[PDB]
Design a protein around this ligand. Sequence first.
Ligand SMILES: *[C@@H]1O[C@H](CO)[C@@H](O[C@@H]2O[C@H](CO)[C@@H](O)[C@H](O)[C@H]2NC(C)=O)[C@H](O)[C@H]1NC(C)=O
Ligand SMILES: *[C@@H]1O[C@H](CO)[C@@H](O[C@@H]2O[C@H](CO)[C@@H](O)[C@H](O)[C@H]2NC(C)=O)[C@H](O)[C@H]1NC(C)=O
Ligand SMILES: *[C@@H]1O[C@H](CO)[C@@H](O)[C@H](O)[C@H]1NC(C)=O
Ligand SMILES: [Ca+2]
Lengths: 449, 446
Amino acid sequence: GAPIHDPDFIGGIGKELIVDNASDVTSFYPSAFQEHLNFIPAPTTGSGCTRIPSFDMSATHYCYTHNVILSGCRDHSHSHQYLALGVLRTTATGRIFFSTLRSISLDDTQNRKSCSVSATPLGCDMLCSKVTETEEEDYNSAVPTLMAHGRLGFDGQYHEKDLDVTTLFEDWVANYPGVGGGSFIDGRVWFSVYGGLKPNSPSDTVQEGKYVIYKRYNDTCPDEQDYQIRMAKSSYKPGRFGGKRIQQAILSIKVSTSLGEDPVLTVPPNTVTLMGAEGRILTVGTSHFLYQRGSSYFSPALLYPMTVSNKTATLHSPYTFNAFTRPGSIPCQASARCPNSCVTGVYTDPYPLIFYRNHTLRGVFGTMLDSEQARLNPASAVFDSTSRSRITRVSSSSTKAAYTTSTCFKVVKTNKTYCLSIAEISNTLFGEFRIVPLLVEILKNDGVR
Amino acid sequence: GAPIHDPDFIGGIGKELIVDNASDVTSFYPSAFQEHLNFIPAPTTGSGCTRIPSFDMSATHYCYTHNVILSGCRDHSHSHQYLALGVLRTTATGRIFFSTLRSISLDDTQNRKSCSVSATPLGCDMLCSKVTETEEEDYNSAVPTLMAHGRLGFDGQYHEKDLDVTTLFEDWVANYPGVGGGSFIDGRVWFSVYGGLKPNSPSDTVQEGKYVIYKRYNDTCPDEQDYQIRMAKSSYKPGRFGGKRIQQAILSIKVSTSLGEDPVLTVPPNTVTLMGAEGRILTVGTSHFLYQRGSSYFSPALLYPMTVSNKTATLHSPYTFNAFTRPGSIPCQASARCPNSCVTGVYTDPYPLIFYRNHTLRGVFGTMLDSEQARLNPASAVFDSTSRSRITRVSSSSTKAAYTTSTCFKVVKTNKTYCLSIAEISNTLFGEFRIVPLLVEILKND
Ligand SMILES: *[C@@H]1O[C@H](CO)[C@@H](O[C@@H]2O[C@H](CO)[C@@H](O)[C@H](O)[C@H]2NC(C)=O)[C@H](O)[C@H]1NC(C)=O
Ligand SMILES: *[C@@H]1O[C@H](CO)[C@@H](O[C@@H]2O[C@H](CO)[C@@H](O)[C@H](O)[C@H]2NC(C)=O)[C@H](O)[C@H]1NC(C)=O
Ligand SMILES: *[C@@H]1O[C@H](CO)[C@@H](O)[C@H](O)[C@H]1NC(C)=O
Ligand SMILES: [Ca+2]
């Protein structure tokens, strides 16, 4: 009943789990899907769905949230936001299970979507967007998207406060939380956000001519330099949103009794970040990372090192995992190696797992959609910069996936490393999407050498 | 007040679909699942299930029913019965779809169980059992199981009349409908029924020593005759129910504005029928058939010819489809070839599809559970006495399945034969059982 992770987890949450410098990264791999957890509620109705999962865990508790739709799973539909606060416990037999301390289903009328959540000392901080219109209409609207900062405390109470997006996102036509989890850092909660810049606005003007071309390993692009640059520049203004610059941002907010207190929007230079996309701000040990969904031409998982300076942050050259690809429409498929304009891909974050003694991230765990173009075939595995380990297929090759957010930890008591993988999956004839939690232990083959 | 399907279906409902004497039966086969029909409601909750499906279709309308559990799918939970009256339609594109005209969700305090539905001229007749105890607690009791004859009319109203089981099933300790659809024949609705007989009751006495042994095609049981005969006899009184003879029966009720009118329970001789099990009363063309779930030692799909005469039925030696097996626990697994005593298997009916010119049945469509012992891997196909055509697996090999009921019809316009396969299935991460309708066209290597 303790409002903290059970003693066995103490000291095994949020840190660098494995630091092997000698042994290969891919030698570490996911086992068979263990103790199928049930902290995530199934959809309220049989014809409805659960979608857009966000999870973040600190050394004391975890936070989880998801959007629920009563009929169908089409975005242009009414939805409720489910938010929960919980801790990692063990049974008498050592069985790991996610225990919910508090939970709330926002059954009101506010149209919350693209919500992200973060574990803070005060509980579970949530960043949501509120809109009654279309997404493609939002980038077509003149005003920024409404956003709110909420919190489900340890006391079960929920408080929320709408942000003054008029001034905070004055340079944006559309703005949304990255859906991925946010991170608590130096008294502030950091949520990755994305959207469209108002053309010719101060923010849009500062990003003019700014771009970056990330290459694939051992697979260079055959297109000429002049053309690649031309394509990279256009990747920030995909035709889908009519020329608007799809921008990546970072929003920090002070964690205190007052919600939405002192919000500061940092917009990293596009010479670092690719096209704005869904993302996640996480902290593993002492380093911070910004996961960016590969919505543009870049297929391999991006893990941007994030450093903090007061209320703003700076992103450095991203860690890339070539094998950890994501499905996408041509010319931005899983094998795409050339810069291009597109709004595709799927959110499938990599959790910093293996590090060097010097703390440089060496390997990550994540449930990728092992598919070339279609959002399907989820598979858990460990990936370094170029390869992947023995995979643990979530289900069949027919399983459609929309999101996979992974968070790994250790049971210091048994010294075993585990990875929680929350996936929004569905089969062709079993119903709409539903979020399912999968826990897998990270193994290592010693008898190899 | 027949609502009528679509002019495209006239002459193509409940008829002999494919009449051929030359073409190899297995040359006919199911295509890919054309579409995923929407007439069947998903479980009301995401943590519950839809189970025990029943379906019957007549010239002008179809009837469908399933049981719904709000939390989980424990057969020992409170539930409500969903009943629907519908029609076979077709969009401008020519896309087949089942339109549900009327539907009611019986959510009272009664425990309807093992319901069977039938499309009658007055609507959708449902035969349910009303229980207050478990399967075993029921067979141990002295009194028969309560049953009710109900009906969803074209007007949307549902009327129900509990049958006088005390007299109707006086010789029974437990009795339930076969779950499979019932059929309208000669002014009355016919429902397969099964349960356990009261020891020494007249019905039981008449069955003493009666048994029948059905062999596999080219898989002769090596057991000595005396041993087989003893096993066959014992198969009727499996240990599961402490020696109570599990009997197959047939209930016919007069179809009229008065429910439960003139009930007549027929109990076929166990020299014809194997141990009582879930079943269905089908009518294809002028012929009638009784499908009996292979709950005993017999694995191949069974279709007993059924002839009716003044309120009573008569079953004959059944058509068997050797490759249309079903999974079962040992020693009555799908590969079984010898008589034995057991209560296993799963409901997976064969729909009469291909007939000889003379009307003798030869081929059927069905969605079998392509497994040996576990209720997994549903797979649709066309079957004859010894073979299986090319298949269309419904899902993965680890897909669970509790029931599959198929009904084939024909679009007279495009003259294409289709088969509705309604299956209660589940999968690993996607929750409890759920009834899903599947539609496949019947094709041929010619
Ligand atoms: C930690 O040690 C590794 C040694 O493998 C360093 O990796 C090298 O880093 C240099 C420059 O960053 C690269 O040019 C080499 O290609 C890397 N070699 C390998 C095998 O990765 C890493 O930079 C060190 N990290 C820190 C923070 O000192
Ligand atoms: C319809 O035709 C079939 C085809 O012959 C008949 O089935 C045959 O019946 C004879 C009985 O003399 C046996 O050789 C076999 O049972 C069948 N033979 C073959 C080659 O299949 C069937 O009996 C006919 N139906 C009726 C009602 O007469
Ligand atoms: C059945 O067995 C006989 C031998 O008794 C054989 O000639 C025939 O080909 C077999 N048929 C099949 C389908 O195996
Ligand atoms: Ca009883």
